[PDB]
C-alpha cells in the first residue's frame, strides 16, 4: 500500500468521467489539440505561411476557417514554442504555423491515450478488448496522412490544414496531382466506408423489423430490457427474409458483428497503405498501356484520358495560388483551356 | 494493347493460389465429419 | 466514368461546399463509424462459450433463444469510454439509431 | 478445428517445434538473399557506373553488399569500375553462395528440431512441464548481440580486422569501401558522419554486454514479471514487435532524407537534393570558379564531369515515380549514354533566359523561360491566338556547353522548343530507349522502392503490436467474458474503484 | 559551445519537467486525502 | 468515347457511356434507331440499362 | 488476353454466386 | 497593458461572485475530507 | 450531502468557461466592418 | 449512480443560476473586449483590415526562411511603418 | 520418444470458403487491371 | 524427454522459469535509464530536425568533407 | 533468348494444375 497503489486507486475511481493512468496523457493532450484548434480558428491568420486568411477575427466563416500548416520554407521543423524558428515568442509561433505541429502532436499523443483509455477500461471492466483493436483504423488514417504523408514531401506545408473547406481543398489536390481516385487502395477504403454505411444501416433495420411483440404498446422501444436473456429479434426471420430478398442471409450472430468490426477496419488500414504510397508521389496515376496507344492514335478516348485532362486544369489552375512560395507564374497562354472557357 | 505481358502470369497466379489453399482446407473438412 | 461525374459535378455545382452533401459525409463516415463500434462492443462482449482452439463464431446457434453477448458488460465498458449517459442500455434504440443516422444522411445526399 | 488464421498457435508451448519454424524461416530468409544476389548479377551491367549505376537498374541487395565492403565479381570486374581486380572468397557470387549454404544447413537443423522436439532442455526442471525462461533469455541474447555489435563497430567498420563501409563526398562522385575512425564528439550524431556509425556500434556493443550481463544476473521484479505477462512468451512476440517497427520507421526515415548509411552512388539521389537543387549549386559553383580563372564557356562546362550533371537531373528522382510503374529506372527515360551538354537559351536580345523546372509534384509542367531577375519572357503556349510569349515571337535559341553538343546553337523554334521542353528535367541526356524497349516515363530508385516497403510494413506491425499485446493482456478472456458477470462489476458506483471488488460501500 | 537552440533545448526540458511534476505532485496528493475505504 | 474492354479500356477505365447530348432527354429505344449501329454510336444502351434498372 | 482474364475472372464470381446461394451449409435451428 | 485589465475585470468579478455564494458550502465538503 | 467540486465539475469548466468567452469575442466580430 | 450532484438538479437551482447570471455574462463581455479593445490582434499578431499589404503592395509576405523568418515577418511589419 | 500432443486439426467451413474466394476473386478484378497497366 | 549432452550443459541456463526479485525491485533504477535514454532520443531527433543546433555539426551531405 | 512468352504460364499451370489435384485428394485422405 505505497504511493503508486494510492494513485491508482484514485486514478480508477469510479466517477463521472473516469481518469485511469491513459487520463494522463490523453486529457491535457486530448484539450490542448481541442483548445489549439478553436483558438486558432477563432483568431490565427495563414497570412504568412499562405497568403489566407482562416479565422473569424478575419472574417471567415465555419466552413472556411482553418489552422493551416505552417510555410514550406519551414520544412518538417517541429516549431516548438521555445525552437530556433519562433524563439520563444508565442506571437511569431501563431504567425509561423505553430500551431499546426500544436494540434497535430497534441492530436497523435491523445489518440495514444485515447486507445489506452480502451484498453485500460475493457481490462478494469473484464470485456475484450476490440474496441481498442478496431480503433487503430482511425489512428492509421491519422498518422499516414497528418504525419507520414508531409513527412515524404518538401514540409508540413503540404500536409491536411484543420479545417473544412481547407480539407476540401485538401481532397482535390490528390485528385489532381496523385490522381487518388484512380488508386485501388482509396477504392478498398471507399468500399470499407461504404461498406461500412450499408451495414450499420442493414442491420439497424434488421433488428427493427424481426423484432418480438414484448409489450403492448404502439412504441416498440419500451419492450426491451437491459437484462433480458433472451434476443429482442428473431433471427430466424430475419435469415429466412434475406435469404429468400437477397439469397445468402447471416445464420452467425457473432460472425455478423464481428464482420460489423471488420469491414470499415480494414478499409480504413486500406486506405492508409495507400497514401503513405503517395508521401513519396509513388501514385497509381496512370495505365501505360493506354497512354502509349493514345499518343499515337488520337481518336482513342476514354474516360481515363478525360480525367487526366481535368488533373491537368486542377493544377495549373490551382497551383500559384495553393503553393505560393514556389513563385509560378502561369501567363494566359500557358493555361490549359477547352474550347470557349 | 502494350500492356505488361507478366500481368496474366501475375493474375493467375494471385488468384491459383490462394484459392486452391482454401480449397485444400475445406475438403479435408468435409472428410472429418 | 463515375470519377468523370464527380469531378465536373464539383465544378459546376461546388458540391464539396453544399450542406446536403456534408450530412452525406457525415452519414457514411457515421454509418462507418457505428458499424465499427456496435461490431467491436457485441464482438467485446461475447459469453465465453468456447476454447481457444475454436473460432468463438461457435459459441452461437442460429436460433437460440439466449442472447450471445452481454449488453450491460458493453454498456458498462462504454458508458465509461465516453460518460454513462452517452450510452445506450436499450438494444431497441441502439439498433434504431444505427439504422437511421447513414439513412438519413444519404436522404440528405441524394437530395443534394 | 482450428481456424485457419490460428494454425501457428501448435507452436506457443511446444519450443522444440519453435525453434524449427524459426529455423525454417531464418533459411528461407538467407534463401531469398541468395536467390536475389544471383538474379541481380545475371542481369546488372558493370560497364558504366557514371550513367548506368546499380540504383538506375532496379539492384536492390547489390547496393547492401556494397555498403559493407564487397564490390567485386569472380568476373574480374568491380562496382567503381576498375577492371583486373581479385577479391578473393567474398565476391557478389562468394556471398550469394555462402547465404544459399547457409539456408541448407538451416533447412537440416529445423527437420532434426522437429522431429527431436521432445528436448530435457525445454521442461522445467521442477514440473516436467515445458517452460522458457525468458528474462535470462534476453540476458543471454542480449549479450550476443552486444558482443556482434561491439565487434562489428570495433573490427569491420574500422578496418581493423575488416574492410571498412561504402563512404563518399558529398556529391557522390569519388565513393569507395574505406576504413572509418570513430566520431566520438558530438558531430558522431550527426547523421551525416560515417565515424558516427563506428562510434555508435562500439558503445551500443558495450552497453548491451553490460545491460546482457545485468539481465542474466538480475531476476525481473515481481511487479513488473506479473504487469508484462513474463511468463507468457506472447508478450515477447509483442514487443519484439514494437521493437520492429520502431526500426523500420527509423530505415525509412533515413533512407528517405539520406544518411551516411545511405549514399547516392548506390541507392540514388533524395528528392530533397532535387528540391534544394543541391547538385545544381556545385556545379554552379564550379563554372563560376572555371570562368573567374580565365576559361571560356565551353571550357568550364566541359569540365563539369558528366557523373555530377546526372544527378541534377529529375529522371533520377525518386519522387517521380509510379507504383505500378515497375522494374528499373532504365526502363522508363531509357539508358543514360551521354551528357548532351548544359543548355543556354537566349532570346532575340541576347538575353539568357531560365527554364523554369519542373517540382517532383507534377506529372506534366509547362514550359516556361524567364530571366536571371524571374521574369517571364518566353514559354509555349497553349492557346496560340493571344499568346505574346511564344519562342517565335521572342526568338529564342539554345547553345550548348559541354557535352556532346558542346559549341553548338540551335534556332529553328521546333527544337528549341524540344531542348525546352526536355530542360524542366534539369541537365539534358542522352539516352538509349532501344535496348529495354523503355516507355519514356519515371519509376522510382530502390531509394524510393525502400522506403515505401519499409514504411507499409511498419505501419502494418503496428497493428501486429496492438494485436498480440491485447491477447498478452486479455488473455484470460480471448475466447470470451465471464459468464457470470453480474451487473455490480459493470453497473455504476457500486465499487469505489472500478473492477476491484473490495471497494463496495 | 552553447547555443541558443541549446539553450531553447533545456527550457523545454525543464518546463516538461514543471509540468509532469506538478501534474504529479497533485496527483499524489489528492490520492492521498481522498482514499478508498476497503 | 471507348467505354468497352474489347476496344481498348480495363476493368477499372471501361464504362457504358451516357447517350448522345444530341438526344437530351429524348427516349431513344431500339426501334426508334435506323440500325443497331446507329443506336450503338449514339450511345442506346444506356438509356436501356438505366431504365429498366431504375423500374426493376 | 487481358481481355480474356477480366471476363473470366467476372465469370468465376456468377459462378461462385450461383453455389453460393443455391449450395450453402442450410442453416439449421438451434 | 491596459486592455488586459478591461478583458479580466469581469472575470475577476465573475469568479469573485462566486467565490462568495459558495464558500460557506465549499467548507462543509472540505470537513468531509477528514 | 453532495460534493460541490468534482473531477467532473473540472472538465465541465474547463470546456464552458472558455466557450463563453468565446462566444463574446465571436459576437463583437459581427461588428467588424473594413 | 456515481455520486456527483444531477445536472437536472443544478441548473434548476436558486444558487446555481445566482452564480451563473453573472459567471456568463462576466465571461461574454471578457471576450467581446478582447476582440473590441483590439488586444486579439496584438496577442497572435493577426492582422487588421487595414494591414495585409502596404498601400500599394500586392505582395504577399511570405516567409521564405526557416531561421530568419522570425526576422521576415518583423521586416514586413515595418514596411508597414 | 512420444508423438507430439501439440498437433491439431484445421477447420475451413463452406460459408468460409465462398467468402474466401470472393474476397480473392473480386481483389484479382480489382488489381488485375493494374498488373497489366 | 531425450537428454543429449549439449542439453545438459545449457540445462542450468533454462532452469529459473518464474523466479523473481521481490516487490518493486529495480523498477526505481529501470526508470532511471529509460528517461536518460528518452532525453537521448529527443537530442537525436531534434539535431536530425535542425530544432537543436550544434557548434561543428553541419547536418547536411557537406558533412562527408 | 526469344522464347515464347506464353510458355512461362503454359510451364506453371502445367505444374500447378495437376499437382493441386494431387495435394487436394491426398491431404483429404490424411483427414479421414
Ligand atoms: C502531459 C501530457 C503532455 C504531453 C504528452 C505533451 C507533449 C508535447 N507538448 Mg505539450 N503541454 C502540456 C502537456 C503535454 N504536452 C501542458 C500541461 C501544457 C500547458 C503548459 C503544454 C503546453 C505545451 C506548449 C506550449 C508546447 C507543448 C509542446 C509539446 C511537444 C514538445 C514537448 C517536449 O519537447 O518536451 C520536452 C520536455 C520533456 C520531454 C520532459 C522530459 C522529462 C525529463 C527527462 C526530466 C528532467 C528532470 C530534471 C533533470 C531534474 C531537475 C534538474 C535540475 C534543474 C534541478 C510535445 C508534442 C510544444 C509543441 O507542440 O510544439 C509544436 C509547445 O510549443 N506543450
Ligand atoms: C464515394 C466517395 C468517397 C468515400 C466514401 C471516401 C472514403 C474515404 N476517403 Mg476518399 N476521396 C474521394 C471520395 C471518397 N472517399 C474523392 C472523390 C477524392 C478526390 C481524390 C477523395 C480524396 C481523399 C483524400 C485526399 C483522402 C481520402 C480519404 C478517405 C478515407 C477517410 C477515412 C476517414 O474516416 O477519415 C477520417 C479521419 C480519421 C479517421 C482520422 C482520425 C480522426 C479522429 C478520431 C477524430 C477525433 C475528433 C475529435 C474528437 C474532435 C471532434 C470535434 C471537433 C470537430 C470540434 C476513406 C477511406 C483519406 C485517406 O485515405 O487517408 C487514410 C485521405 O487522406 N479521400
Ligand atoms: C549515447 C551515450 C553517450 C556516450 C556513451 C557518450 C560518450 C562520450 N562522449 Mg557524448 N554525447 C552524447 C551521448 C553520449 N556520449 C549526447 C546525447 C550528446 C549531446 C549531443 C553528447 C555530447 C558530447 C560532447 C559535447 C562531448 C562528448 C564527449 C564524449 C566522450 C567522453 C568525454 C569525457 O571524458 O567527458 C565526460 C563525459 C562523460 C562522463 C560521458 C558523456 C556525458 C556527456 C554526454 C558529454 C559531456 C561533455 C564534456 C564535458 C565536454 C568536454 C569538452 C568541452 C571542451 C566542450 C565519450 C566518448 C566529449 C568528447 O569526446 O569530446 C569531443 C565531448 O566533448 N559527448
Ligand atoms: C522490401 C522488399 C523489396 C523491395 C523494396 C524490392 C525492390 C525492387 N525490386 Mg525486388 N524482390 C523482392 C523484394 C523487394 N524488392 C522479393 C521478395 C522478390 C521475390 C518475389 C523480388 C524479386 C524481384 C524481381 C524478380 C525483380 C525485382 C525488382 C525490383 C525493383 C522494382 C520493384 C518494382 O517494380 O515493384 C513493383 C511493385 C508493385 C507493383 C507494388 C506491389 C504491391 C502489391 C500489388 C500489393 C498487393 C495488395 C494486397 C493483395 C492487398 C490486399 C490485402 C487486404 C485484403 C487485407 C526494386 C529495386 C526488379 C528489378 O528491377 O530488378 C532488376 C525485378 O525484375 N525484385
Ligand atoms: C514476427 C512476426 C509475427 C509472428 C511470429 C506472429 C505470430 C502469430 N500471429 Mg501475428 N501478426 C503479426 C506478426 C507476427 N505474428 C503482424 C505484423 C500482424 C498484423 C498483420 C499480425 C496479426 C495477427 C492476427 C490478426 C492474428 C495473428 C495470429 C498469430 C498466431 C497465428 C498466426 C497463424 O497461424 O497464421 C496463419 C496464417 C496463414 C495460414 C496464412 C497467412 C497469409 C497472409 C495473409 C499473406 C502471406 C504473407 C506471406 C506469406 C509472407 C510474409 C511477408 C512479409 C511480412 C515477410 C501466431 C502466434 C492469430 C492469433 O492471434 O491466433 C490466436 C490472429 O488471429 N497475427
Ligand atoms: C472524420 C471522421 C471521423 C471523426 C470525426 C471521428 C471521430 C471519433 N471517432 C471516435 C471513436 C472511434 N472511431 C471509430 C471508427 C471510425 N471512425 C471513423 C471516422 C471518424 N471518427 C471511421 C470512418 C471509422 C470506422 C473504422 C471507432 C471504432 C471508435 C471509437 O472507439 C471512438 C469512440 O468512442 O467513438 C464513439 C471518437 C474518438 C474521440 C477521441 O479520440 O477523443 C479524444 C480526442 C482527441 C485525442 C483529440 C484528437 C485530435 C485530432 C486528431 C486533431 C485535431 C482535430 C481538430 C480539433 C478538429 C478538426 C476539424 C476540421 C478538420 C474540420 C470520435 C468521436
Ligand atoms: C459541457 C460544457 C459545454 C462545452 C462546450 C464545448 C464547445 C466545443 C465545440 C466547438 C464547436 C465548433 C463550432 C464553431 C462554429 C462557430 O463558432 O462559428 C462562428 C462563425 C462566426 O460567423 C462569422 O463571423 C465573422 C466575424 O468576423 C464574419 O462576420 C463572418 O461573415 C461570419 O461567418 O459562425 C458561422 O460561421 C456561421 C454560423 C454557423 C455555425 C457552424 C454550425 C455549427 C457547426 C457544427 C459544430 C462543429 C461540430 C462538428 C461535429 C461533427
Ligand atoms: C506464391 C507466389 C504466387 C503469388 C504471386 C502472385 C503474383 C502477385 C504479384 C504481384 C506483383 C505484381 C507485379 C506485376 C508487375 C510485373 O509483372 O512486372 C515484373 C516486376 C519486375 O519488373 C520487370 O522488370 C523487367 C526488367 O527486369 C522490365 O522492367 C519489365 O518491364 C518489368 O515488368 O516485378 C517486381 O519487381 C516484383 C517484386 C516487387 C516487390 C517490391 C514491392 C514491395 C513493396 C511493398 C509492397 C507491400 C504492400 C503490402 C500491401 C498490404
Ligand atoms: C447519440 C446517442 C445518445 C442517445 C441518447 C440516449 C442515451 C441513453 C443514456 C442512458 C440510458 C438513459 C438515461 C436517460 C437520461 C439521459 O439520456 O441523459 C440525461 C443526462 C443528465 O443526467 P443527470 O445525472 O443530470 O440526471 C439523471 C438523468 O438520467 C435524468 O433522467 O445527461 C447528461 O449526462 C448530461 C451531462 C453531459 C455533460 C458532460 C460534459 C462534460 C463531459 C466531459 C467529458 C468528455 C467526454 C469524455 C472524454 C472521453
Ligand atoms: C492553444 C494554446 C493553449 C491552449 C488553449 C486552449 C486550451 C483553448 C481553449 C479554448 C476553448 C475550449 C474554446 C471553446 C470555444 C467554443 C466555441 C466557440 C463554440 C461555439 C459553439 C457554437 C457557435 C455552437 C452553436 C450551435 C450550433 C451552431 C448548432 C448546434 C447547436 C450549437 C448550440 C452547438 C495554451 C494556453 C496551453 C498555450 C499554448 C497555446
Ligand atoms: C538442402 C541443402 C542445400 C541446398 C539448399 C538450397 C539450394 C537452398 C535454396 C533456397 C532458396 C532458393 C530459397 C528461396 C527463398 C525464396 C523465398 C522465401 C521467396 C519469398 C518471396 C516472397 C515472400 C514475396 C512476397 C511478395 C510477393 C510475391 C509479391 C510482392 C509483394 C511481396 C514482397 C509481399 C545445400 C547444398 C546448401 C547444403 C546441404 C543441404
Ligand atoms: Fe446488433
Same mark, same amino acid.
Given at each position: 500500500?505505497? @504511493? ?62 482553418? +489552422? ?77 496522412? =497528418? ?58 433495420? #434488421? ?29 430466424? %426471420? ?29 478499409? /480504413? ?58 513563385? =509560378? ?13 | ?14 488468384? *491459383? ?9 475445406? +475438403? ?6 | ?99 437511421? @443516422?447513414?439513412?438519413?444522411?444519404? @436522404? ?5 | ?60 541487395? /547489390? ?155 538480475? $531476476? ?20 519484439? &514487435? ?65 557523373? *555530377? ?73 497553349? $492557346? ?59 519509376? %522510382? ?61 | ?25 497533485? *496527483? ?11 | ?48 440499362? &438505366?431504365?429498366?434498372?431504375? *423500374?426493376? | ?17 450461383? =453455389? ?11 | ?31 468531509? !475530507?477528514? | 450531502?453532495?460534493?460541490? =467540486? ?29 | ?21 453573472? %459567471? ?58 | ?13 463452406? #460459408? ?6 470472393? /474476397?480473392?476473386?473480386?481483389?484479382? !478484378? ?8 | 524427454?531425450? $537428454? ?62
Amino acid at each position: 500500500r505505497g @504511493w503508486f497503489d494510492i494513485l491508482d486507486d484514485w486514478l480508477k475511481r469510479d466517477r463521472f468521467v473516469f481518469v485511469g493512468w491513459s487520463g494522463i496523457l490523453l486529457f491535457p493532450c486530448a484539450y490542448l489539440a481541442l483548445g489549439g484548434w478553436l483558438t486558432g480558428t477563432t483568431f490565427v491568420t495563414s497570412w504568412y505561411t499562405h497568403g489566407l486568411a482562416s479565422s473569424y477575427l478575419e472574417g471567415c466563416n465555419f466552413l472556411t476557417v482553418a +489552422v493551416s500548416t505552417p510555410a514550406n520554407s519551414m520544412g518538417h521543423s517541429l516549431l516548438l514554442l521555445w525552437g530556433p524558428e519562433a524563439q520563444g515568442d508565442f506571437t511569431r509561433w501563431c504567425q509561423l504555423g505553430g500551431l499546426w505541429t500544436f494540434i497535430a502532436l497534441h492530436g497523435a499523443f491523445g489518440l495514444i491515450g485515447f486507445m489506452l483509455r480502451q484498453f485500460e477500461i475493457a481490462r478494469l471492466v473484464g470485456v475484450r478488448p476490440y474496441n481498442a483493436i478496431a480503433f487503430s483504423a482511425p489512428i492509421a488514417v491519422f498518422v499516414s496522412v =497528418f504525419l507520414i504523408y508531409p513527412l515524404g514531401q518538401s514540409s508540413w506545408f503540404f500536409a491536411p490544414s484543420f479545417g473544412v473547406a481547407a480539407i476540401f481543398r485538401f481532397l482535390l489536390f490528390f485528385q489532381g496531382f496523385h490522381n487518388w481516385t484512380l488508386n485501388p487502395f482509396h477504392m478498398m477504403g471507399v468500399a470499407g466506408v461504404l461498406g461500412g454505411a450499408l451495414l450499420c444501416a442493414i442491420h439497424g433495420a #434488421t433488428v427493427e423489423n424481426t423484432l418480438f411483440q414484448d409489450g403492448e404498446g404502439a412504441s416498440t422501444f419500451r419492450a426491451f430490457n437491459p437484462t433480458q436473456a433472451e434476443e429482442t429479434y428473431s433471427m430466424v %426471420t430475419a435469415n429466412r427474409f434475406w435469404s429468400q430478398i437477397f439469397g445468402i442471409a447471416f445464420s452467425n450472430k457473432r460472425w455478423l458483428h464481428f464482420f460489423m468490426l471488420f469491414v470499415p477496419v480494414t478499409g /480504413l488500414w486500406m486506405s492508409a497503405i495507400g497514401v503513405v504510397g503517395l508521401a513519396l508521389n509513388l501514385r497509381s496515376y496512370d495505365f501505360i498501356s493506354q497512354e502509349i496507344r493514345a499518343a499515337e492514335d488520337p481518336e482513342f478516348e476514354t474516360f481515363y484520358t478525360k480525367n487526366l485532362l481535368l488533373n491537368e486544369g486542377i493544377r495549373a489552375w490551382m497551383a500559384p495560388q495553393d503553393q505560393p512560395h514556389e513563385n =509560378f507564374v502561369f501567363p494566359e497562354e500557358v493555361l490549359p483551356r477547352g474550347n470557349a472557357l | 494493347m502494350e500492356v505488361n505481358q507478366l500481368g496474366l502470369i501475375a493474375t493467375a497466379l494471385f488468384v *491459383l493460389v490462394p484459392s486452391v489453399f482454401l480449397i485444400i482446407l475445406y +475438403v479435408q473438412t468435409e472428410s472429418q465429419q | 466514368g463515375t470519377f468523370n461525374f464527380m469531378i465536373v459535378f464539383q465544378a459546376e455545382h461546388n458540391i464539396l461546399m453544399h450542406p446536403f452533401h456534408q450530412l452525406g459525409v457525415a452519414g457514411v463516415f457515421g454509418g462507418a463509424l457505428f458499424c465499427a463500434m456496435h461490431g467491436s462492443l457485441v464482438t467485446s462482449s461475447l459469453i465465453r462459450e468456447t476454447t481457444e482452439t475454436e473460432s468463438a463464431n461457435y459459441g452461437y446457434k442460429f436460433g437460440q433463444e439466449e442472447e450471445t453477448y452481454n449488453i450491460v458488460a458493453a454498456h458498462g465498458y462504454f458508458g465509461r469510454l465516453i460518460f454513462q449517459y452517452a450510452s445506450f442500455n436499450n438494444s431497441r434504440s441502439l439498433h434504431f439509431f444505427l439504422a437511421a @443516422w447513414p439513412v438519413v444522411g444519404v @436522404w440528405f445526399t441524394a437530395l443534394g | 478445428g482450428l481456424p485457419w488464421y490460428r494454425v501457428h498457435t501448435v507452436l506457443i508451448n511446444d519450443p522444440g517445434r519453435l525453434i524449427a519454424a524459426h529455423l525454417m524461416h531464418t533459411a528461407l530468409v538467407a534463401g531469398w538473399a541468395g536467390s536475389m544476389a544471383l538474379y541481380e548479377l545475371a542481369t546488372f551491367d558493370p560497364s558504366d557506373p557514371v550513367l548506368n549505376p546499380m540504383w538506375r537498374q532496379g539492384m536492390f541487395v /547489390l547496393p547492401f553488399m556494397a555498403r559493407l565492403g564487397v564490390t567485386g565479381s569472380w568476373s574480374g570486374w568491380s562496382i567503381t569500375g576498375e577492371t583486373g581486380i581479385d577479391p578473393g572468397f567474398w565476391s557478389f557470387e562468394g556471398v550469394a553462395l555462402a547465404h544459399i549454404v547457409l539456408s541448407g544447413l538451416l533447412f537440416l537443423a529445423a527437420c532434426w528440431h522437429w522431429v527431436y522436439w521432445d528436448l530435457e532442455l525445454f521442461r522445467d526442471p521442477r514440473t516436467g512441464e515445458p517452460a522458457l525462461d525468458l528474462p535470462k533469455m534476453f540476458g543471454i541474447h542480449l549479450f550476443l548481440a552486444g558482443l556482434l555489435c561491439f565487434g562489428f563497430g570495433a573490427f569491420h567498420l574500422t578496418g581493423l580486422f575488416g574492410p571498412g563501409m561504402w563512404v563518399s563526398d558529398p556529391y557522390g562522385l569519388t565513393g569507395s569501401v574505406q576504413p572509418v575512425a570513430p566520431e566520438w564528439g558530438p558531430d558522431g550524431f550527426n547523421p551525416y558522419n560515417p565515424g558516427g556509425v563506428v562510434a555508435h556500434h562500439i558503445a551500443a556493443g558495450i552497453v548491451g554486454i553490460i545491460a546482457g550481463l545485468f539481465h542474466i544476473l538480475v $531476476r525481473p521484479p515481481q511487479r513488473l514479471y506479473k504487469a508484462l505477462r513474463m511468463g507468457n512468451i506472447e508478450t515477447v512476440l509483442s514487443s519484439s &514487435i514494437a521493437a520492429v517497427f520502431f526500426a523500420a520507421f527509423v530505415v525509412a526515415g533515413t533512407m528517405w532524407y539520406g544518411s551516411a548509411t545511405t549514399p547516392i552512388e548506390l541507392f540514388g539521389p533524395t528528392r530533397y537534393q532535387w528540391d534544394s537543387s543541391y547538385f545544381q549549386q556545385e556545379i554552379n559553383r564550379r563554372v563560376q570558379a572555371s570562368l573567374a580563372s580565365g576559361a571560356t564557356l565551353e571550357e568550364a562546362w566541359s569540365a563539369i564531369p558528366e557523373k *555530377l550533371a546526372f544527378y541534377d537531373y529529375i529522371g533520377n528522382n525518386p519522387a517521380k515515380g509510379g507504383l505500378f510503374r515497375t522494374g528499373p529506372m532504365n526502363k522508363g527515360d531509357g539508358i543514360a549514354q551521354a551528357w548532351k551538354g548544359h543548355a543556354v537559351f537566349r532570346n532575340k536580345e541576347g538575353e539568357e533566359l531560365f527554364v523554369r523546372r519542373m517540382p517532383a509534384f507534377f506529372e506534366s509542367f509547362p514550359v516556361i523561360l524567364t530571366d536571371k531577375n524571374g521574369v517571364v519572357k518566353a514559354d509555349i503556349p497553349f $492557346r496560340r491566338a493571344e499568346s505574346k510569349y511564344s519562342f517565335e515571337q521572342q526568338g529564342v535559341t539554345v547553345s550548348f556547353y559541354g557535352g556532346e553538343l558542346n559549341g553548338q546553337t540551335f534556332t529553328d523554334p521546333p527544337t528549341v522548343k524540344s531542348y525546352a521542353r526536355k530542360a524542366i528535367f534539369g541537365e539534358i541526356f542522352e539516352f538509349d530507349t532501344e535496348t529495354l524497349n523503355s516507355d519514356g516515363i519515371f519509376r %522510382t530508385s530502390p531509394r524510393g522502392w525502400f522506403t515505401f516497403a519499409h514504411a507499409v510494413f511498419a505501419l502494418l506491425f503496428f497493428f501486429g503490436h496492438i494485436w498480440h499485446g491485447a491477447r498478452t493482456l486479455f488473455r484470460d478472456v480471448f475466447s470470451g467474458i465471464d459468464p457470470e458477470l453480474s451487473p455490480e462489476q459493470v453497473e455504476w458506483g457500486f465499487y469505489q474503484k472500478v473492477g476491484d471488488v473490495t471497494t463496495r460501500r | 559551445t552553447i547555443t541558443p537552440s541549446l539553450k531553447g533545448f533545456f527550457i523545454g526540458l525543464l518546463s516538461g519537467a514543471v509540468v509532469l511534476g506538478l501534474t504529479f505532485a497533485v *496527483l499524489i496528493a489528492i490520492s492521498q486525502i481522498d482514499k478508498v475505504q476497503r | 468515347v471507348s467505354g468497352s474492354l474489347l476496344y481498348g479500356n480495363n476493368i477499372i477505365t471501361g464504362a457504358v457511356v451516357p447517350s448522345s447530348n444530341a438526344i437530351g432527354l429524348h427516349f431513344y429505344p431500339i426501334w426508334e434507331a435506323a440500325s443497331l449501329d446507329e443506336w450503338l454510336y449514339n450511345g442506346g444502351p444506356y438509356q436501356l440499362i &438505366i431504365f429498366h434498372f431504375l *423500374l426493376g | 488476353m487481358e481481355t480474356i482474364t477480366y471476363v473470366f475472372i467476372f465469370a468465376c464470381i456468377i459462378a461462385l454466386f450461383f =453455389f453460393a446461394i443455391f449450395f450453402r451449409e442450410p442453416p439449421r435451428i438451434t | 497593458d491596459w486592455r488586459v485589465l478591461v478583458v479580466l475585470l469581469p472575470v475577476l468579478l465573475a469568479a469573485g461572485w462566486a467565490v462568495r455564494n459558495i464558500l460557506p458550502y465549499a467548507v462543509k465538503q472540505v470537513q468531509k !475530507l477528514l | 450531502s453532495y460534493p460541490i =467540486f468534482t473531477v467532473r465539475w473540472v472538465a465541465v469548466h474547463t470546456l464552458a468557461v472558455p466557450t463563453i468567452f468565446f462566444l463574446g469575442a465571436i459576437a463583437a466580430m459581427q461588428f467588424i466592418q473594413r | 449512480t456515481t455520486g456527483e450532484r444531477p445536472f437536472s438538479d443544478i441548473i434548476t437551482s436558486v444558487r446555481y443560476w445566482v452564480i451563473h447570471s453573472i %459567471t456568463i455574462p462576466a465571461l461574454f463581455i471578457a471576450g467581446w473586449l478582447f476582440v473590441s479593445t483590439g488586444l486579439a490582434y496584438d496577442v497572435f499578431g493577426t492582422p487588421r483590415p487595414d494591414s495585409y499589404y502596404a498601400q500599394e503592395q500586392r505582395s504577399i509576405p511570405l516567409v521564405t526562411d526557416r531561421f530568419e523568418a522570425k526576422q521576415q515577418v518583423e521586416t514586413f511589419l515595418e514596411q508597414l511603418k | 520418444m512420444e508423438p507430439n500432443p501439440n498437433r491439431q486439426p484445421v477447420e475451413l467451413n463452406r #460459408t468460409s470458403l465462398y467468402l474466401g474466394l470472393l /474476397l480473392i476473386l473480386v481483389l484479382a !478484378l480489382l488489381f488485375s487491371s493494374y498488373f497489366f497497366n | 524427454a531425450r $537428454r543429449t549432452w549439449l542439453g545438459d550443459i545449457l540445462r542450468p541456463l533454462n532452469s529459473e522459469y518464474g523466479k523473481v526479485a521481490p516487490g518493486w525491485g529495480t523498477t526505481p533504477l529501470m526508470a532511471v535509464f529509460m528517461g536518460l535514454f528518452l532525453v537521448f532520443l529527443l537530442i537525436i531527433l531534434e539535431i536530425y530536425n535542425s530544432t537543436l543546433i550544434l557548434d561543428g555539426v553541419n547536418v547536411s551531405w557537406k558533412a562527408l568533407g
